[PDB]
Symmetry: D2
Subunit: 267 residues, 4 copies
């Protein structure tokens, strides 16, 4: 298997449609031994991850909780055994209050809300690296999930701004992680029809926002030279596993686009 013998921490599972769920599944299919982290609804997350191919300990991690972050390495070590370290870390965490997305006007989002989104979606990539680098092996790999923010788009609003911040954080995390012989990269995925995204398309954050996302999805598959299936997270999960493997050893501070090639085409 691609990840045989690797110990990998995967954050961000909340439903069976979470990108992290598919990352975890593919990593286990490829021989990785996982530790999972979940936010707030741990009973739910345990029941969800019961469906993964193999057993994996679940640890609580709210990335806005300083105590959780300060205890995290020790809790991971307890889970994988003293004297063992991680080979991989997956950050698949994102959040923006509803004022910061959808039809809610861009100018009307209070900074308190934007700040909460940037905390969870961008600063926490650095928070997790700080917490886990001391228990990572040389040759290891930190991977985060990104959505290409280099151009503005409808409805994504401040979440786009948070992703622009994350891309910058990643380049700095790479400097720190390099001291440990560890790589840091993001995977910029195309749109994936998770539960929350389906709810948005259905109008949860306003009708015109749903309409705009639907147009965005359609354009994506049209632009993608090999097409793009928003209902299939597996290609994205495979790409994360590629970055976790030994096969991209000279790539760091970087962004790998798992988007069907859409970002390379104007139309």
């Amino acid at each position: 298997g691609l990840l045989d013998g690797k110990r990998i921490l995967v954050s961000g599972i909340i439903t069976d449609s979470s990108i992290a769920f598919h990352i975890a599944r593919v990593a286990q299919e490829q021989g990785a031994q996982l530790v999972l982290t979940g936010f707030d609804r741990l009973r739910l997350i345990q029941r969800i991850t019961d469906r993964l191919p193999a057993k994996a300990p679940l640890l609580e991690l709210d990335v806005q909780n300083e105590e959780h972050l300060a205890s995290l390495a020790g809790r991971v070590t307890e889970a994988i055994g003293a004297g063992n370290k991680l080979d991989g870390v997956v950050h698949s965490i994102g959040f923006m209050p509803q004022t910061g997305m959808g039809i809610n006007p861009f100018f009307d989002a209070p900074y308190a809300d934007v700040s909460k989104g940037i905390h969870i979606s961008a600063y926490s990539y650095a928070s997790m690296a700080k917490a886990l680098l001391p228990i990572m092996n040389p040759g290891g790999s930190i991977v985060g999930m990104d959505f290409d923010p280099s151009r503005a788009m409808p409805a994504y609003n401040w979440m786009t701004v948070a992703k622009s911040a994350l891309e910058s954080v990643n380049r700095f995390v790479a400097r720190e992680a390099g001291k440990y012989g560890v790589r840091s990269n993001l995977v910029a995925a195309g749109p994936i029809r998770t539960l929350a995204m389906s709810a948005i398309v259905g109008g949860a954050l306003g009708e015109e926002a749903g309409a705009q996302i639907q147009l965005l999805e359609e354009g994506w598959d049209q632009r993608a030279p090999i097409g793009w299936n928003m209902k299939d997270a597996t290609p994205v999960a495979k790409t994360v596993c590629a970055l976790l493997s030994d096969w991209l050893p000279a790539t760091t501070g970087d962004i790998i686009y798992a988007d069907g090639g859409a970002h390379t085409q104007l139309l």
Copy 2:
């Protein structure tokens, strides 16, 4: 003059070495009528701006103060006269707590501090646009100051992240400003030896940070095909005035590099 008859708001003057001071001077030399905004030390700022070629009303604006922002358009209107609107707005505002820059480790900056920096340096570009767009004329221009954050660099740390966020905010502000017939752009300047920058080089945020910035400056002038003089803000001020003028009417959501061409050269 390039800006004859234009009413322009300029924020960000705090010393005679502020980039905004030079923007204001050049804009006045080119016929613009200014309104100035200053943060906290208004007596100081008034004494500083007494040295500008012409009189300009000074208004208080702390961009973290919701009341200041809510009253700003009315205060500007009072200063320029009912029935008059602005043709231009200059955002020359930036701040990051010392934990977020210098030799202070990247991972050690508390989010409260980073958030304060992002508030002032990135979110406030949107805050000011929200406040002022309703009193801007079609054909008008909003300009912000940027430092190219597309690559990580030593010591700049979270301020780089804030600039990455600002570049994203600018692209969204352009969408809103377009509804008013108004352009929004950033000027990415090379390093300018302001008071604070000279203090950093002198070691105020740690010795190795000062050393690294000094190396950065030297490399900049070396890379720049037409050279780069860190002691001369005038080229930057001229570029801001170009964007405030009628001569770049089809440019918005964009970044103009006033950096000697350094970002186009590897070495």
Copy 3:
């Protein structure tokens, strides 16, 4: 006027819809004294440029002709008078054989044809700089016309490749031009409905190619936060004049987007 007293060479006029025609008109309105260069049909070009606001000498220049390039500086000097030099040069030249564009398959373009297109559209920017830099004043400006090639698009095919090459040539020309105190930049324009472009939309290079360009144009105005009028070259001409002026003195090796802001927006 913005360009009062400046001596500027403008290449690329062939019809009254040429972008160069509008560049020349605006530059003359702003006080510039022009020298024009034309390819092959000089009687036609003279009759066309009779419609410009002021008289300007016309010189023959085929950029594939080594003798024309070797004699060009002396012929310009004769036209502007011994002891006078140019302050500006405008390259508004492009060509790709029909095999290299339209519905003709990308893989079917013979290299001889592609090479001819790259010669005229990219290498000639360096050819002209070589020829003219020795008779340019410090503070001068070389400007070329570009169409953003960072993403592939239908029908533009090898012309896109030639523009990618031109952007690279520009960054090297900036290194050479810097030795003379001269700037070199491109203006990346949105689509402009010139004679040839109208013919393409009308199906001259195949029906589906025309259809695709029409979709491209429509999308452009939709994406542009301030809109985009393909029938109006004046905004582009103004931008070229901005670069020819003294108001962007620290920009070189760079690309200024005169495209309504469309390239900053995904949709």
Copy 4:
């Protein structure tokens, strides 16, 4: 093995220091069955490739020879057996006449020489795709070698321009290759001390050119957060194999940076 059962064509071997030699070695270590192509010195190339872990047929291919390209698919089919197709193609071909590189002035390179370099280094990526796509399996992968040309640099001169053209060609090739279910990507490698590169450093294309490349190499390892070893092609070869594998299935028209992360860091 990562590439078990895959039939892959590898071009560009000329010495045991060729990047293609290391690509071929790693691909064979991972179970790939190779077909090799060589230019001009086939006796030499056969003796060189005798050192690879396994036997691989060698075919002649001069990419400037239309007859070679027209016969190539049939010759490959003969080598791998009727009814078998390729899963992968590696383009590791580049050339620029000495007038187009080194201390020879940028402006002094004759177009005939530049054109020859662009033919071999950029157009041939499309030539090979045209030739081989009809005998490639769905899920297949075309990979080319790139050196990041987004910024100008000393001495690389017109080869940089050719790489800018190649990056554009790759985005179009991806459109064509998509019709076959095939991906097309480039790997942008850091500097590798091949025979020719060592000769350049030693002064073969002028003293100052050698000096500049040496400075470039040193800066590269300094900037790279995980370092960069110019004497080790294996990380680059592994990255090519990653792209040839099934593990990056949603990436096309793109560029993967195998450069130690140097391009993500300013200093």
